[model samples]
Every structure is written in C-alpha cells, then in structure tokens.
Target: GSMAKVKNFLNAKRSKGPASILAIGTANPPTCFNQSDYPDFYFRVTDCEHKTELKDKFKRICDRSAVKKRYLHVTEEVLKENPSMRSYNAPSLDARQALLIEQVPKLGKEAAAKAIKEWGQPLSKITHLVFSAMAGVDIPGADLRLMNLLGLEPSVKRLMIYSQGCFIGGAAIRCAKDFAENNAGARVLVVFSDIMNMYFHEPQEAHLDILVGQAVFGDGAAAVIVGADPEVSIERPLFHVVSSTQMSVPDTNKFIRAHVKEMGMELYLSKDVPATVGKNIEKLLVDAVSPFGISDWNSLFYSVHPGGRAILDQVELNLGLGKEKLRASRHVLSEYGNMGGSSVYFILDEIRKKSMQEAKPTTGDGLEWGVLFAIGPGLTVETVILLSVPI
Candidate 1:
C-alpha cells in the first residue's frame, strides 16, 4: 500500500546534497570454498537421504549466477585449532557468544590497524567510534574492544550498532559525518565486522540455513576514518556527506531476519525476498540520487551489496544496470561471500584498485561519482554517494 507513497517521495527528493566516502579498508577470513563444495559439507552434518538431489539443486541455482568462490569464517586451521568441533554438531548460543568475545578484539584490531595505516592517522586523534555488526554482541562491544586494543583516546565517544545487517555500514557513515559536521576537528572511526561462523543449525534444515547461515557467510571487518580537515587530505577523499534515507517494509520483515536461539543464530530467508526487493529498488535509487541531480543511470558508478549471486542478479536486472557495471561487486562476492556490512567496503576497495590501475598520472581535475547501496534484514536498503579520489 505504501509502495506508491515511497515511490512518490523518492521522485520528489531527487535533488539533494552530496556525501563523500573518504577512506575504506577491509579484512576477510582465510578459507575459500565454492558453492558446489557446500553440499558435501552439508551431507557430512546431516543424514539427508536426498543428498544428490540437494546437490543438483544447489548446482542448478548456482549455475544461473556467476559466483565461483566464497570465503568461510572458519578456516581449516580454525577447525583444527579445536579438534573436538564437528560439522554435524551444533553449538549452543552461549558457546557462540564465547567465541565472539574471544575473536572480536583480535579481528577488530586487525581491521582498525589497516585503516589507520592507510589513513596515516594516529588512533588517539579519533574523536568518535561507531562499530556495526550482526554476528556477535557482548559487553564492551566491538567498538570499545577496538578502542582499548588500539589505544584510541579515552575521551572518544563510542556508538555500537547491533543486528542492523548490511545497512548499518551506510548508517554508520552517516552518523560519523554528522558528528564531524557538528564538532569541528572531530574525526570519526567507523568499523564493521561479522563472524557468521558462530551460527550453525541442524542438517535437516541445511537447505534453508545454508542459504542464509554462517556456513555461507564469511568473516570480514572494515574501517573508515572520516573528518573535515583541509590540511589532512586523504588519497581520494571521495564525496562529502550529503543526505541519507532509510525505509522498512513492514509485515514483510520475515524476508530477512536473524534471531538468537538456543541453537545459535538462526536466519530466516523468504523465497519472495527477491521479488519484494525488485518491486521497490528502482524507485529507491532514483529518489536517493535525484536530489543530487543524478537522473541518468549511465553517469553514476553502482557499488551494490553482494548479498548473493541471485540477489545481485535481481538487483541488476531490476535497475537495468549493465553487467560490466557490477564487476567489483561480483568479484567481492566470489572472493569473500557476504561479509555483511564489510562487503560494501570490499567493493569500494576493488573500485579504487581498478581506478588507480587505469588513471594516468597527469590527468586533469575530473571526479567520478557513484552510489553504494546495501540491503539488510529489516527489509531495508541503504544508499550512499561516493567520488573517486586520485591516489
């Protein structure tokens, strides 16, 4: 009922201000596996008689798409580290929580260190920290843990985002930009990490869970340092913060959701999700960029969330985006699977790599503007505009 209203709202707000993405960094787990290999692992855990049939179905669905590889959170070494851990055995929520508490500090520090190195900024200079994740939650949170691990200033404000999914990254960027705008000299550090391996379900439900569970999801963390200092210029200080909008599809929440159960994290994925998203995504993008005078799709770079091969295909087809347009996104999905919020940053890194390789050293002043979009469990999609900066 409100789809039409949402469409009209987007149409009215086509021309808004612009926002820039300053610096992006990403981290991923070591293990890499293909979709075809998943069923063998699936059968090892469950006593499903129709293993071949299930494998065929997986291959059929995967063949239509272009994802050839995806990283898993738990590498062979991680499994080897705990020999008692079995694929067929499920971990309780408490066990999973314990795993998170143990790993967050290590992973968060790794991601933050990379970001600090790239930005050439001291951790003490950061004024705000925003941590976004969907996989784990604990006291002290990932932000606080990272602050202590990296020796960030004691006075730095911390904001933790839990259970927001991929959209949280965009939301975090918006939050950081707002803070910097309000307080001069304030620098915001935004970090996102997801360890999907903490959630494993039974083998009978493998069909559904594998499609949306930790087995298919990978571990990744990203850090972005943003501020408005003219003297502290980053390599490619993409666009500045313009504006952001969030919309939730009520009643259709079941399409994508994660819950903490006794059996660890349970993710429910509805088959109707692609269609529901297809129906609304075009108008959402059009409206989001309209305010910035972006009416022609050809003029923009599209860095979309790589949720999966199917979802990415649906998004491209629905928006009439060219196959070549999503090369970085497709690459990220194949290499890293879905890192939740960190997936977008991985795509951004790929874009930067591609741009640097192609641009000439003496090219005159020219900037490419692009939109980064991500969808999450709330049936929500987040979009941000970015500009390519010269290295």
Candidate 2:
C-alpha cells in the first residue's frame, strides 16, 4: 500500500510530456587568437622562446588540431600581471582561483541573461538553477554568485556541480530534464562554464599531456532554459528531451584524468581515448535508441561534443554517420577548440542556427530525431536522445 500510494502520487505530479530546451545562449571571452599565431604568442607571453623545439612541437600539434581559432579568458595582460603562473609547477592556485571567482560568474551571467531574454520570460519565472563548472573549492560556489548576478528569486532551487569533466553539459541538461518533468510549472536554468586559466602554465618537456591541454582547451559559457509543457505561443521548444543516459566504459578510469594541485590542474590524456570511444559508441547508441524504433544510425541528426578532431572522426567512423552529420561539431571545434563541458551547447546551438537558416522542417537539421553525445574523464559517455520540433 505504501509503495503503490507513493508511486501513484509521483506519477500524478509528473508533467505529461518530456522537458524541452526552450532557449539557448553561449558566450566566450573577448581575447581571441588565431590557431597559427598561438604557438608564437604562447611562447612569447610565457617567456619561453629559448625552447625553440617545444614551440615547433606545439606548432605541429596546432597544425593538425583542425582548430582555426580559439577564445581564451587568460589574456596577455592577465598573464603579465601574474608572472609566477607562467612557470611550470609554480604555486599559483590562489591567483587562478581568484580569476575564476570573477570570470566564471560574469561569463555565466552573460550567457544566462541571453538565454532568459530569448526565453521571453520574467527573471522570477526561473524556478531552479543547475550550474556545472570546474570552479574548484569555494565557499559560496559559482551557482550562488551567478544567481546573485542574475537576480533570480531568493527561493529558487539551486544545484551546484563542481569538478565535472567534459561530459558536464549533457549531465547538467539531463538533471534539468528531471526537474522540469517532475515539477508542474518549474523552469530550470542550466549553465555550464569553463575557463582554462586554471590549467594554463609553462609547458614541460617531459609532459606532452599538458601540451595537449594547452593546444586544445579554451574558455566559454553556455546556458539553456528547460521546461515541460510549453505555453502555446509564448514559449518555443527547441529539442524535446526524449531520453538521456550516462554510461562509463568499463575499466577505463585512467584514460582521461584531471588532477588539481597547488599549481592549478594537471591534465592527462591517454593515446587510447579515441579508440576507446570508437569501440564503445555504437553499442551504446543502439541500446539508447533501439527501443524507440531508431535503427539506422545515419537517419538521425547528431550533436556530438567536439572534444577533438580525432574524437569526432572516431564517432563518425564507428556510427557510420555521413560527413554532414557532424558539421556542427566540427564547425564549433574549428572556431572554439574545445570549451570542455560547454562545447555541446555551442554544437547544439550551431545545429539549431543552421537548420533554421536553411529552412529545415525541424530543428534537428530536418530530421525528426537526433542524439546528443559527450565524452570525458572516467571515459564517461553521455547520450541524450532528442526529438526535433517544427521550426
């Protein structure tokens, strides 16, 4: 009797339809750099021109990185102000934390404001906040700071996710989906932001892993307003959340790792990451969508995290998806490198933009269904099945 009563009550409280992303907005730092110029700029700014070999090595990595440009929060002036941060293994965590305390909230606020504006709603209408970031250990946390900046309701529910890896965008959205569907009239604001300022430091000859991080990661913030049962003409639904799943590839804990130390964060990437993802992706996709009658992998649109060129390539190869399937992912990567957890939103937003510009029938590039994917540390894979609404 107890179990049945609880189940019935929960079922009655749930919304009739799935949660939908009503609006999306993304923001990046003003300091931008062309990929080709980065090697020289990085070396010059860090005062490491004496290491010509490393500069050449980084240039070669950039040459194959498929990124044309990237936006960074750490400007030349910021680096100049904190010279110790330029040294390898320097005790500069305080400086990096101080920078994040300001930048993360400001960037998150900017993106959230845009999302609220596009949602066409009052500030108080937002009932919940889901913020995911690598803001490290802080007393007030970035979510509360962002809430203050946005002037959200004091009673608004808040969830602060810290130290999540690149899969965080999808993870945040998935959490928001549950909040939307369970609450009758709730609107959840989901924010994901990352600034690599914490990870920026002098390159070490022995650690190519750090060099890879230097070459690939960038800074950005993305926000989305999620709610179920849209108000007829007032609200727009971008992608309906059909289902979301998170899976960890077995025995791959050591593959992709980020360890925070006194000198900021230490990043490590194994050579087998792409291969690991490629090997496991298809089965995961099929299991995620097969019950919904989705059989052909190429039939649905894809919003994959542009973690790197190789990861994208591996996903494409394993899923047997066509070149155009990953256009948004590739384009975002070309422009922003990888914004860690925030990259998926940019990819989703890019897909939405292109679909509407091209006058596609639905938001998923004219397709009725799609998949949103992200991979990160713990070798975690997040797959969210999306159903496109008419544009």
Candidate 3:
C-alpha cells in the first residue's frame, strides 16, 4: 500500500511528457572586437604597451584561441574612465559592481524578451524563472532586476542561480526541467548571463589564467523557454529533456576556480583542465546513456560547453567522436568566445539553426538522441540526455 501510494502521488504531479526547449534567444553587448586586434587593443587601453613581452604572449594566446571575434561589456571608454580597473592590483570591485548592477539584467532582459517573442506566448504564461549568472555578492540580484525590466507577473515563481560558473547553464536547464515537470501547465524561462569584465584585469606575467580568460572570454546572455506538454498550434518543442545527471571529477578543486578579491574577481584556469575532463568524461558518458541501452558515442549529437579549443579537441579525441560532431560548439566559440554559462544555450541554438536549415529529420542533426554536457568549477560534470523533436 505504501509503494502504491507513492506511485500515485508521483503520477499525479509529474508531467505526462518530458520538459522541452520551446524557444531560445541570445544577446551580446554592442561592443565587438576582433581577436587578432585584441592584444594591441587591451594593452593600449590599459596603458601597458610598454609590457611588450606580456603583450606578445597575449597575442599568441589570442591567435591560437580559435575565436575570430567577441562581444565584450568592457570597452576602451569604460576602462579609461576607471583607471584603477586597468591595474592588476588596484581595488576596483566597487566600480565593477556598479556597472554590472545595470548591465547584467539589461542584457538578460534583451535575450529573455526575444525568447518570449519566439515562444509566441504572452508574459503571463511564464510561470517560473530560473536566472543563472556568475553574479558576485549583491542583494536584489539580477533575477529581481530582470523581473521588473521584463514586467513579468508579480506572481511568477523565481529562482536565482549565482556563481555556479560555466556549468550553471546546464544546472539552470536541469532546474527548469524539474519546475516544468512537477508543476501543472508550467512554463519556465531560463536565463544565463555573463559579463567577462566582472574579472577584467591587466595582463600579468605571473597569471597566465587571467591572460587566457582575456583572450577567449566574452560577455553575452542566452535565454530559453522550457515547458512540458506543449500547447499544440501555439508552442513548438525543439528538444525534449529526457534525463539529467551531475558528477564531480575527484581532486580537481584547483583546476578551475575564482576568488572575489578586493580588486575584483580573479580566475584560475589550469592547463590540466582539458586533460582532467578528457580522462573522466568517457565513464560519465557511459553512465549517462546506459540507462537508455545506448553504447556508441558517435550515434548521439553533443552540446559541449566549448570551454576552449583544447577542451573540445580532447573530448573529441577521447570519445572518438566524428569531426563534424562538435561543429555547433566550435562555431559558437568562434563567433562569441565563451560567455561563461551563457555559452551552452548559444551552442544549442546554433544546432537548432543548422538542423532547421538542413531540413534534418530531427533537431539533433538528424539524430534522435543527444547529450548536453558541461565541465566547470568542482570539475563538475552536468550531463543531460536529450531526445530531439521530429520536424
């Protein structure tokens, strides 16, 4: 009787079908810079052109980053007005925080607005919001600010996800799935935004991580509408969220991390990060897919985080995936650089565009099944099994 009662309760609350990506929207700040010109631009703005050795090193990293250009929240004017921000050791958190207070939600609202328009739904239908960002300490965070800006219903349920790093995109999607699945007729709007300038600092010879970040990281926001049991004729399902899982690669706390220092946010990106993820990802993938009785990796499409060129290369090599498998990720990385957690959605949207343009049978590049995975702080792996919707 106890087991029967539990089953009945779950059957009553759980959604009849999987949560699906109904629509996606992405936004980038207006200021764009070419990767080839970034090294000179950065050094000149920071008044560190005299640091020729560091500038050359930065140029090398940028040239090899596989990023053609990026949109950034920080421009020469902002840095010039706030000189302290250009100094590696100067205290400038206050200035940075002030800018983010306005910029973060503004960018997110732009993306969310586009997503709502694409979903072909009114604002009242958005029952829940999951706002994800690398937001540092602040009350009345981006979630609240965005709510007001977008004029979402006051009754709307809200969840604010902060400082989850790059994996927050997957984590936010996972949370949205639960919200949609458990709440009847629920429609969740998930937004992930990142301002790489949150940690912007001058090039330092001792900190290669900072240089790496400057070379590849950019500012952008991505929003998606997730719902279960779509309203036929009105709502369209792109990809269904089948299952989600999370695991940590043990003893990798030091590989990727950040510190909220007096000067501003400081990041560390270990050279071993790609290697660590490459070594452990195969076992994780096996566990993520085995429940569905699947074994072959290439049969499935992938939405990887696109953390860096090396990270993508490592995953492809380790899994023996086809060169074309990660094209969407590589494309987004080339166009937008890594927008922290916001990147995964950009990659997802790119895949959708490709599939639609090609008139593929399924949204997952003609494949019915796919995996969305991201590796970030905690060396955390967030994996979601996806079933593409048929055209």
Candidate 4:
C-alpha cells in the first residue's frame, strides 16, 4: 500500500445520496424604489453638494445602473416623513442595527414560509439551517430568528455565514449540499437575507465606488430546500446539484471588500473589477463544467448574479454568448438591482419560472443544464452546475 492514509482517503466514497435542490422561494418588502429616483436619492444622501459635475456623474450612474427598481423595507414615504433618515447621516450605526434587528426576520420568515410551502415539507423536517447575510448582526441572529418565526424544531442544527458579500448564496448552497449528503435522509434549508440600505455614514466620501454602491444595492431574501431524502419527489423535475467550484484571482485581494465602520458597514470596489472578471471568467466557467462534458453554450440555461450593468456586460462580452443566455440576470438586475449574493436567487427564480411556463423540457428538449455564476469579495468567482431531473 502506497501511503495507507492517502490510499484510504482515495478509497472513501462520497455520500450515498448527494443533495438536490427541490424548491426555491424568495420575498422582499412591500416597498419598492425606482432607479429614476436614485439620482436624487444619491444626491440627497451625500454631502457632495454644490458640485455640479459630481452630481451629474451620480445621475449618469443611476441611469446606467441597468436597475429599473429595487425593493426595500424602508419606504420612500418613511424617508420623507423623517428628514434624518433621508441620508446616510442621522440613522447612526446603532439606529441601522436596530432597524435591521426589527425587520430582517420578517423578510426571512416570508421567504422560508414560501419555500416550505413550495417544497411541501413540514417545518419540523429541516435538519440543518444555513442563514447568510452581510448587512447586519443580531444577538440571536437569523438562525434563531427564523427558527422561532418558522417554528422549526428547537434541536435543528444551525450554521450562519455572515460578514460576507456577494457570493454568500453560492457559499450557502455548497454548505447545504454537504449537510444533506453527509446525513442520510437529511433536509437542509439555505436562506439568505441582505439589507443593502445599510452603508457607512460617509457623506463626504462620495467616491464613484460609493455612488455605484448606492445605485445597485437593494434588500431581499431567498430560500432554497436541498436534500437527498427519499421524500424528494422523483415525479417533478428538480435542479440536481451536479458540481460546483470557486476560483479566486491572484494579486487582486483588494478588488472587492466590506469594512466595518463607525456609521455601519461600507463597501470597497475597484473600478477595474469588470476588466479583471472578464479576463478570468472564461477560465472559471471552463474549469467548473468543461470536465462534465459541456461543450456548447446553447445546450445549457444560464444565470449570473446581476452585480451591476458593467459586470453583466463584461460577462456577456467574455463568454461571447447570445443575449438570450443572460436574459434572467438582466431582467433580475433591471427589476431588483443587486441584493448582494441574494440577487442570484431572484435571478434563478426568474429564469426558473420562465422555464416552467413552457411545456416540460427534458434534456432532449434542449437546454437541460443550468449554469449559475456569482462573484464576491476576495475577487472570487462561485459557480454551480444544475442538472435537470427526469421528467
């Protein structure tokens, strides 16, 4: 035996039943904000006043954000009623944290309820809980909040991935898959809730990155049920997790990052992100799926996190795929902007619903595979390979 330990590791087989995505559910607050008003919103929220060029630049970015609207719990009426809340000024970090504690659970509860309904599973059945967010923190946190709100069993195992930016959804799903596969007949619940309105109180720091951050970020929550339990109906088509991979760029550690600030949390994004992503995106895709026998783009459905207009454009240019391949990402961007990694769930829900509207599509019907991609801080790219179940 050559290195018995190494040989033992190689001989160890994967779990008997790998996880599969059974249902996806998403929810947002009732209030919605439109990009048409973002220019003024950005201008009012910052102290960069009396500077015409900077104001004009903010307008251009808003117009070009490719986000038609985004949903948030804080309504425009709520802002107008309280002048202090108008800008990133008076809602101190304490105030923002207070608001998040009061509201985050509600949105999360909505998404979880919808997912359980769609999955037709009892709340008591969830063996593992994975909740992700970067916007705020809580004493009891999302796992406890959602557990109490959804009435999940008290003993359900919990895992919370926090203080992370855009790729949390992919990260959450990957963790959920492991739990489901590692535990036989297990059901894992992955939930994501992000509050984008929380930003560092840096009115004077109205850099372009901050401006774009204001333009694209929003609030939303999503839920997905993953398991290999026999209860996973074989009759309906499910998105089976085939393979996944994550790749981080070299020497670009500072390209994307989030910071804890006195006011709240702030985001740092380099202007060169699009260029970097475009350069490495192809390799990320090829490395993730090329070994799985994917040779042509037309054979699979695609969805990417709508980070922003430039990010979407860069992927389109790099992949050289037709406009149709990115329709779901574009539509989600236009409708919801970027709600952090949570945005991809809306992207998937959008495309998944669209695909469901037509007659049942098997692999023979074409476009059976679903390729989902998302990028996050660390200049990291996350991807998932979803296969169509037998019809």
Candidate 5:
C-alpha cells in the first residue's frame, strides 16, 4: 500500500521546488444513501433474489471503517430529460450511459463553479485546462463543458485525460506543474468527475463482486486550480509542486480494469490487486523522490490516496508507517468513500483546510515538503512533491 511507502518517503530528506496548491473545489449529487439501503434499492428495480445475502456479504468484506455515503449526480429534472422508460429492474447499458452523460456535465460544472468561487477573479486568468475521468466519456467530456459554463477564455489550451482512474488526480497536478513551468504566467484548472452509479450491476449470479462494489463505490467530482501566481495572498503560499514521477507495472493490466460495455461499463477487480500494488509501491516512491536527493524520509508530510482499508493496511505494513501518519487518508475515506480520481484531491483539500485553520507560523525560510500519491486501474502509481511557500 502507498501508506507504508509514503512513510518511508517522508522519513528521508529531499530537495524541493516552488509549486503550491492554489485552490480546491468538490461537488456531489443531491442523493445520499447508506450501506443498509442497497438491498431495497436493488430489489426495487432488479430481480436479484440474493439481496439480503449479498448485502450481508458486502457488510462483512467492505471496509467497515469507511462510513457510508453515496452521491447520485442526477437531478429529477435531468432524469426526466433523459428518461429511462425501460423497466428499472433491468435498464439497458445505453440507458445508463445516457443518464450518466446528462448528469456528469452538470456535476463537473458545479464543481468547477465552486473552484472558481474559491479562486475568485483567477478564473478568467487561466491559460490551461486539464480534465480527468474514468467512468464517463463524451465528445467534449466535462472540461469543455466547464469552459463554456464558466466563460473561461477561448484561447485557453485544453488537455483531456481519460481512463487513468484514481491516480489521475496526482497525475493532473504533475501535468499542471509542467505546464506552468513552461508556459510561465499560466494558470491551469483540473476537473475530475466520476459517477460509478451508472456502472452499477445488480449481479444475477456474481454475488461477491457485485456486493463488494455496491458497499464501497460512490460518485463525486472535484476541481482544482494551480498557478505560479498566488490566488490567496498570504505571507507565504500553502504548498508548491516541485517534481513528479509515475510508475506503470507492465503486463499487469488485469489487476484492475474499467471497460465500456453495451450495458454500461464493466469493472474487473482481480483478487490480486492489493498484493500486486503492495509489491511495487516502494520502488515507485523511491524513484519518484530520487531526483530530490532524498534517501531518508523524516521531513515530508504524506497525502496518500485512500484506495480502501486493505490497500491502506498493506501499504502501512509494507512501508512501516505509523498509525497516526495516515490520519488524512483514513479521514477522507471514512467521510467520502472511494471517489475515484477525486479522492486524492479531497485529501489535499482537507489538508489545505486544516493547515489554514492551524495557521502555524513558519519558523524560517525553509520550504515545507509533502508528497501527493494515488493509484489507478493500470496498476499505476502517480506521485508528486510539493513545497509550501517560503515563509
């Protein structure tokens, strides 16, 4: 798991850079449901007879530490616009995709709007746009929709990233830093949205797989803006991105996968996912921070992706991170479940909020270093180092 690798990374001293987090914004659907609600929800529309058995199995295998919360991005009006006239018990994949496309844009827009609010006048100043997703895809996806909704400058260069899964969040930040470094005076907006509900499968026979997903997965969107120029004026900035590294495990694509199907989307979660991820994470982290001349990890704060309880536990054991070191990661999962690519940004958002509230004065001009890491379906791990504004 990334937690243990993160602990090792933090214990090492490393060279840092000047990139900082400017602002973060998040959004979710209007509907919220608990784990206990799954059986009734499934029974209402599906003929799946093992609802009780499935629910119980889900409760046992699911991360009990993860509090229950689900978001459906569609509104009543939006649902009406793309009505699935078919039986709820067996909606076709086409119907589900249509519902997803209709709602995802609105969800992306809402998250971008919130980000712009935190960013204030900087919305118009953005020169680049990066959009990420694994669940839904359209000709324009949600980034273009956001530009139109927010009235961002037409000349802003756009980069669209798809299918990278949860790790895309960290990847987006790294890409943004490279853009800003080269473009100079550039501001980039990264919007990530995922709606797993559209891919929900009321398994007719695959009880365990269906139950595992139902108990844990949910939908949400997050938007963040990064720039060289600070949005909020402070004596020092919150954090600056220094450098990043991404590791892809070759020939290991079967561990986790998301594929579009006529019925909607199909997600394959192999049982080997945790062990495979656990094996390579240490080398990945070491390589990510190697450029900074860090060999010992004591000074860095870790912002790790919360994939699940098992993943976290494996990571902690593999890397030997203390229990308290993962507070931010655990807290995010407990509060929001697994938000796909948006989960990492959610953790970053929480860290920013907490740092601001504490408002501890910096003792000197030394940089504050932290690593943001995430993993996705490719059996990939993405990592980036950030430096707080010099005090």
Candidate 6:
C-alpha cells in the first residue's frame, strides 16, 4: 500500500527518523447517555435533588450540545457491580475516584492492544510509551499501570502527559515524534483516555457551562503507533506526522479551568470559548502552514478536534473553510461526543474510513493537505500539518 505520491510529501530529512502514524485503534466502555434521550439518563443517574429547574436547564444544554450520543465510563455493569452506588453520581470525590482508578487502565489497555496489534509490531517493539489522561489521578498513574497491562520493556522509556485537556492529544503527538526521530526504529505508542464521568458527580453546583460540559464530553481510549518504517503498509492512504505546533492564548486562565473543589471537581468552561478560538485560530493556522509552504488557505482539508458544534462552526467561520472540511469532525462528535484527546484520533479514523470507501466529496488534485487542530483548557490551540491525498 506504499505510494510515492503519499511519501513524496513527507519530509524525510530529519536525521533520526520521521514519525508516521502507522495505525490507530480506539475503545470505550459499553455506552452512556444517548444525546437523544439525555435528560432521561441524567435524571436516572443524578441526584442534584435540590434544583428541580436544573433538569430543565440540563435539557436546554443537551439540546444545545449538538451531540447525538456520548461514550462514558459508567456502564450498566459498573452500577450493577456496586449496587450501593446506584445513586453514585451523588457520591463524594472518593467514590468517583475509585471508579476512575479502576476504569481508566482497563479502557486504555484495550485501546493500546488494538493499536499495537494493528501496527503489527511485537509488544516489546514499542520502545517508547506516551500516555495521556485528564480524569483519573492515581498514585501508580495510568502510565505505570499500562506498562503492566501492555507489558512494556524495562527502563520505562515513557512520558506521562496529564491534564492539558483536549490540547493533550497534540502534545502527545509531538512527544512521540521526538522519540521516533531521536531513537532509530522507535515504535512509539501514544494512548490517551478520559473518564469524564469523574466530573459528572451529582449534587450541588448548578452551572450551565458545567452542565453543557457534562452533556458533551465522553469516555474513550485511543492509541496511535507512530514510526518511520518504509516496510509498513496500510489498506488505504497513509498520513505522515508532518508539523505540530502549540500556542497558548496568553492572559487567560478563567476561560477554562477544572480543579478540585471542596465538594468535587469544579469545571469552568466559559461561554465565550468559541469566540476566543475564532479570534486566535487564524494565527495558529498560519503558523501551522508556514512550515509546509502552504502560504495560502485554499489547499487544505481539516481534521479538527470536534470540541463541539460551536468550536467547529467558529473554526470554519474564522478560516473561511467550507463545511465539507469538517465532515469527519462533526460525524465523530454526533456519533461519540467529545472524547477529549481521543476525539481527534477518532476523526483521523473517520478520514481513513472514508478513504477506504474510495469516496471523495470535494474536488482537488487529491493532493490536499490535512490540517489537524485542537483546543484545550489553556485556551491552547494545537495544529499539525500533513499530506491528505486520496489513496
């Protein structure tokens, strides 16, 4: 499946090796709130008993969520296991963390195994492991647990990325690129997951944005294999990790902050987040393209983090991109909701899915460049440039 047309666009000049995402695989818990019947699910899980109007407010936010369904760690099996936690959403931080400590590793291992298997590399071949998670904060942490779960080689050769929110996927990609480039034949597995249920704890704190966040986010683990190996082949086109850059919008912390409150996790996702991104995305895109000789905007296909409809809509409006560019992002959001760092990988998987069907919705030399973008709590926006030709 190697194609000169695809490889010609990849810059192989880096001394050690250029990292190309060899394969991507993702997993999630059984299921969670369906966006269509979200209010029903919310009522079933939460005991925010005092605010009767909270239900109406939640329903309004869910209607605005622009999501059809979201994957979450709380499955039927989980509640069944701990019958006392039937009203678990009303429990304390300890109770939520307990579920998270157990869930993240299991979800992550399934994703890691699938990615390693798809890369067709022996488990020991993974020289570097980069794990990202924002939900659970266990002592051994998800990275150490994964070493046992995937049984990695000694020395740990690993990086633990935590709590950058959605921007983390880009951060992990950059780190994986460094490992693959610095260490010859390095097969770096980048895996990330989110247990958003940890933040959806019931009780007080009736806030719209928080409710919106609860409605929009999901639980998922996704792993990607990145290395520069010519022998590797895929059924369709290949995406080489070309350029990734992160920009933190300065003088802003209140815009997005999730911290431990006395009661539980206090999340503040501002209403103006979309506008903030719209204002800064142009600069982010410009920097992303300058390296690849993309002096203009017309020759680009988008693979944006489906943060939500507002964010995607803002990106399109700010950059003047057509709706067709965001097809994969929207499709992923509608189907799976916001999976944090894993959401972008899901979008990439969608691109491959479309390519497998040999369907091209837009016109071009089929030599369009794929622009990967994501936003996070730092008011941070991360961008990656790649060749997006049809296979």
**Ten consecutive residues with minimal summed lDDT in candidate 4?**
229-238
Model 4 local distance difference test score? 0.75
As for model 6, its CA RMSD to the true structure in angstroms is 6.3
Give the per-residue lDDT digits (tens) of candidate 1, residues 205-246.
Answer: 354545444334667888877765434434346445566667
Better of 2 and 4 by TM-score: 2
Model 1 / residue 66 / CA error / Å: 3.2
Every candidate's CA RMSD: 7.7, 1.6, 2.1, 4.0, 8.4, 6.3
Cα lDDT tens digits for candidate 5, 215-234: 56768888887776553453
Q: Which runs in model 4 stand beyond 4 Å of their true positions?
A: 1-15, 45-51, 76-91, 200-206, 232-237, 360-366
Candidate lDDT (C-alpha), each: 0.68, 0.88, 0.88, 0.75, 0.68, 0.75
Order of the predicted models by TM-score, top scorer first: 2, 3, 4, 6, 1, 5
Query: Which runs in model 3 stand beyond 4 Å of their true positions?
Result: 1-13
lDDT of 4 by residue, 1-391 (tens): 6699876664453457668877778888887788898666556544446656777877788888888998876554544544454455454566667777767777878887888888886777888888887666776787788898888998889887777767776877887788877776678888888776565333343556877887787888888888874553441326777778888788999998777655566668899998888898878888888878776766767778788888888888888878777888899888887888778888777766766666556421236777788788888888888776544
Whole-model lDDT, candidate 2?
0.88
Report lDDT (Cα) of residue 305, candidate 4.
78
Q: How many residue pairs clash in each candidate at the backbone level?
A: 13, 0, 0, 0, 18, 0
Candidate 5 is scored at a TM of 0.84
**Residue pairs in clash, model 2:** none
Candidate 6 Cα outliers beyond 4 Å, as residue runs: 1-17, 48-52, 75-91, 203-206, 232-237, 295-298, 359-365
Q: Is candidate 2 or candidate 5 better by TM-score?
A: 2
| Candidate 6 per-residue C-alpha lDDT over 220-313 given as tens digits, one digit per residue, 9 for 90 to 100 | 8898888764353442225777879989888867898888643457778888988889899888888778856775565676678887899999
What is the C-alpha lDDT profile of model 2 across 237-308, one tens digit per residue? Answer: 999988888998889999988788898888888988988889999998988887798888888988888888
